[PDB]
């Protein structure tokens, strides 16, 4: 996918320029993406790596600039990890049309109630799992991520009154978003 990769990489570069306002060349990577020249994510990663190295050498391994660069390289690698987890999620998370988190993916994310100590059960999408814990992304404001122990999870088709919940404004908005998602899912309303 020539254009798809190009689109994703543009989000990353743009975001890392925004990250960089904390306080190989950047235009070169910026040039390369803009022209859609990258042939692999791995190749993009190796350029970001080169840039990091040149940067730390340029300014000193303990400069403010080298600290920034190390942070940016880690964030870029995180964005690339996430892009591999689910490309649709990544696209919608960056383009953010109205109700972006409600559009289904293929395959569909498993939906759960996930409990974090002190918050009660909150609705979430499962992004990945291992035997002892599950990486979820919550519905509702900020759409944050947590690793949740297996026994702090219930499937979404369990009735909510059977669960320990704390019914805040934020919790109610999360639940409204969940139900909109469940509807889009049954409708086959994919993002176009």
């Amino acid at each position: 996918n020539k254009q798809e990769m190009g689109t994703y990489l543009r989000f990353i570069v743009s975001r890392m320029k925004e990250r960089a306002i904390d306080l190989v060349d950047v235009p070169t990577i910026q040039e390369k993406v803009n022209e859609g020249k990258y042939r692999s994510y791995e190749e993009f990663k190796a350029d970001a790596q080169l840039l990091l190295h040149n940067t730390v050498i340029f300014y000193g391994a303990a400069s403010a600039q080298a600290d920034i660069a190390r942070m940016l390289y880690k964030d870029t690698c995180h964005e690339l990890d996430e892009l591999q987890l689910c490309k649709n999620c990544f696209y919608l998370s960056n383009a953010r049309p109205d109700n972006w988190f409600c559009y289904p993916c293929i395959p569909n994310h498993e939906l759960v109630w996930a409990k974090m100590k002190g918050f009660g059960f909150w609705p979430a999408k499962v992004m990945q799992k291992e035997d002892n814990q599950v990486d979820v992304r919550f519905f509702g404001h900020h759409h944050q991520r947590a690793w949740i122990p297996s026994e702090n999870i219930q499937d979404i088709t369990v009735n909510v009154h059977r669960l320990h919940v704390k019914r805040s404004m934020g919790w109610k908005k999360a639940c409204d978003e969940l139900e909109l998602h469940q509807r889009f899912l049954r409708e086959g309303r994919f993002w176009k």
């Binding site: 995180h78 996430e82 974090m116 919550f138 991520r145 947590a146």
Partner: peptide, 11 residues
């Protein structure tokens, strides 16, 4: 915050 969400802080 990462595009696909920052880590949710414990209570």
């Amino acid at each position: 915050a990462p595009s696909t969400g920052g880590v949710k802080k414990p209570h």
